[PDB]
Design a protein around this ligand. Structure first.
Ligand SMILES: *[C@@H]1O[C@H](CO)[C@@H](O[C@@H]2O[C@H](CO)[C@@H](O)[C@H](O)[C@H]2NC(C)=O)[C@H](O)[C@H]1NC(C)=O
Ligand SMILES: *[C@@H]1O[C@H](CO)[C@@H](O)[C@H](O)[C@H]1NC(C)=O
Ligand SMILES: *[C@@H]1O[C@H](CO)[C@@H](O)[C@H](O)[C@H]1NC(C)=O
Ligand SMILES: *[C@@H]1O[C@H](CO)[C@@H](O)[C@H](O)[C@H]1NC(C)=O
Ligand SMILES: *[C@@H]1O[C@H](CO)[C@@H](O)[C@H](O)[C@H]1NC(C)=O
Length: 199
């Protein structure tokens, strides 16, 4: 009656919570697919694209911690179900990542356009993703009035590289910071100044 497992697990994912690890997880197979009273998981992984053979470990838990990784690098991951009668299908491959670090990227100014005495348009260049040290989640635009300390800020998505700042006091000097952020946190701030005209 017993046979090899019917299917391999779904929802394979690799994500670090430290720069030196990657946690591989998956949905345990439903018992009807074990074809056996126990099932284990053959986990294979390697840094993406290396001729070196796959690292491999068999576990019964639906997760595996890969340690001693470089910071935010891609890994190829295969998870095959196995039991005493044999192995599931040849598995599909998922890309996972070791853990994120703070970005090193610092946004560069494209321009600050003065719109009115109460509004400006801030434009920056898209950061280089290789310096994000993680998945780019957005930008944070911090600004405050010096005069002419309450600090305001505007969070935009990762796809967005300008923002209008409204409700500014007229004839005032403002400081402005722009930071990229990933899942770990924000990078260093590029630091700018602008003045609103009279009103
Ligand atoms: C945008 O910048 C603000 C500060 O201008 C950041 O605010 C901090 O958020 C953390 C949560 O991760 C809090 O623990 C701190 O107390 C906050 N500090 C201040 C001074 O507000 C905020 O993290 C940034 N937003 C994003 C999405 O990175
Ligand atoms: C990271 O995830 C692993 C696996 O779940 C866990 O053992 C470890 O405690 C986690 N570390 C932190 C700092 O949350
Ligand atoms: C960390 O990874 C390196 C990768 O080159 C490997 O050679 C070594 O086994 C690991 N070192 C430690 C101290 O865990
Ligand atoms: C200032 O410019 C902003 C941004 O375009 C706009 O929403 C607002 O209506 C303008 N204010 C005035 C008084 O024209
Ligand atoms: C990126 O661009 C468009 C317009 O802002 C938006 O519909 C899309 O959802 C954005 N992405 C995210 C993750 O918000």
């Amino acid at each position: 009656g017993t046979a090899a497992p019917e299917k391999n697990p779904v929802d394979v994912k690799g994500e670090g919570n430290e720069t030196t690890n990657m946690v591989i997880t998956w949905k345990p197979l439903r018992w009807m697919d074990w074809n056996a009273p126990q099932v284990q998981y053959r986990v294979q992984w390697r840094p993406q694209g290396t001729r070196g053979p796959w690292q491999e470990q068999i576990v019964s838990d639906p997760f595996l911690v890969v340690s001693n990784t470089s910071t935010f690098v891609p890994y190829e991951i295969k998870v095959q179900a196995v039991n005493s009668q044999g192995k599931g299908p040849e598995p599909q491959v998922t890309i996972g990542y070791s853990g994120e670090d703070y970005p090193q990227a610092i946004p560069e100014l494209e321009g600050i356009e003065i719109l009115n005495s109460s509004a400006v348009l801030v434009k920056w260049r898209p950061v280089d993703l290789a310096q994000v040290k993680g998945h780019l989640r957005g930008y944070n635009v911090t600004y405050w009035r010096e005069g002419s300390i309450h600090k305001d800020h505007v969070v935009v998505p990762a796809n967005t590289t300008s923002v209008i700042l409204s409700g500014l006091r007229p004839y005032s000097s403002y400081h402005l910071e722009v930071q990229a952020f990933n899942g770990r946190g924000s990078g260093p701030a590029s630091e700018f100044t602008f003045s609103t005209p009279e009103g």
